[PDB]
């Protein structure tokens, strides 16, 4: 359709990866599913990175006030701007995008006590759109998910 087949597939993949990762983070009940190698590998690496983020930035994150989806979006965008200020993209940094998505969603759950399904869907969506818009071309140029990402983290 609007983006053409390749770009649409790319966007769908990134969305799928993001919602799968965030559901894993949150411990949303899975259904004897069989993640792709990319999903499994992303889940393993992004989860360990998220814990490193949470440990290393604890003093900052303890002072975050993620009371709504809109606040999460604002914080996400401002942090991403500061992170990618230097224009460098690599797989390590892409993983931190998913991981920080997870950090914000955990804080949102903490403030709301319980999320509804709409919350994780919306966060996964703005995360995925960021990744596609800012790093989708880089991802394509660097082997995509099956050839780049998997070969980087699970050779």
């Amino acid at each position: 359709g609007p983006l053409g087949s390749m770009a649409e597939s790319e966007l769908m993949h990134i969305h799928s990866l993001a919602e799968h990762y965030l559901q894993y983070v949150l411990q949303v009940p899975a259904f004897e599913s069989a993640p792709s190698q990319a999903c499994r590998v992303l889940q393993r690496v992004a989860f360990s990175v998220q814990k490193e983020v949470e440990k290393n930035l604890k003093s900052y994150l303890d002072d975050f006030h993620v009371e709504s989806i809109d606040t999460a979006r604002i914080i996400f965008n401002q942090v991403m701007e500061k992170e990618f200020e230097d224009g460098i993209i690599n797989w390590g940094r892409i993983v931190t995008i998913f991981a920080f998505g997870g950090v914000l969603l955990k804080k949102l759950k903490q403030e709301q006590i319980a999320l509804d399904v709409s919350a994780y869907k919306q966060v996964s969506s703005f995360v995925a759109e960021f990744i596609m818009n800012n790093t989708g071309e880089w991802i394509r140029q660097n082997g995509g998910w099956e050839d780049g990402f998997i070969k980087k983290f699970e050779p």
């Binding site: 690496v45 990175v49 490193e52 983020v53 290393n56 930035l57 900052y60 994150l61 002072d63 914080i75 401002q78 942090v79 991403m80 701007e81 500061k82 992170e83 990618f84 200020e85 230097d86 460098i88 690599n90 797989w91 390590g92 940094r93 892409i94 993983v95 931190t96 920080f100 980087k152 983290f153």
Partner: peptide
């Protein structure tokens, strides 16, 4: 001077680059 979200983003970049080097 710096800002909290500045510091947060710059620390994410550090971790990302460190991970990129870790799996190399």
């Amino acid at each position: 001077p710096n800002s909290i979200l500045g510091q947060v983003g710059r620390q994410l970049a550090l971790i990302g680059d460190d991970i990129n080097r870790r799996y190399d």
